[PDB]
Amino acid sequence: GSSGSSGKPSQEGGKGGSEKPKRPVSAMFIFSEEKRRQLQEERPELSESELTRLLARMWNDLSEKKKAKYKAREAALKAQSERKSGPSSG
């Protein structure tokens, strides 16, 4: 590994565009990524695969006041992994 050219997108080329295709970041993603690192240290016995189940349960325990904290950031984070959504080919 660590060697070998392999383009997934293929065709087209970002000459001077902005942003690039990436994994979205919903409200659950933020809380699932910000809480994971916290649970990992606090709970070294729990693995990432296991934390995924605990993160989902914690998200539900949250309140409308707390959820809004991450839900509000999603609107800004989504812009990174999403540009325009009008009538266009692609």
Amino acid sitting at position 65: K
Tokens of 27: 């409200």
DSSP string covering the chain, please?
Answer: -------SS-S---SS----------HHHHHHHHTHHHHHHH-TTS-HHHHHHHHHHHHHHS-HHHHHHHHHHHHHHTTTT----SS---
HSE-up of 13 (CA within 13 Å, CB side)?
A: 1
Tokens of 20: 């690039």
What is the spatial distance between Cα 30 and Cα 89, in angstroms, rounded to a whole number?
A: 30
What is the spatial distance between Cα 60 and Cα 28, in angstroms, rounded to a whole number?
A: 10
The Cβ of residue 64 has, within 10 Å, a number of other Cβ atoms equal to 7
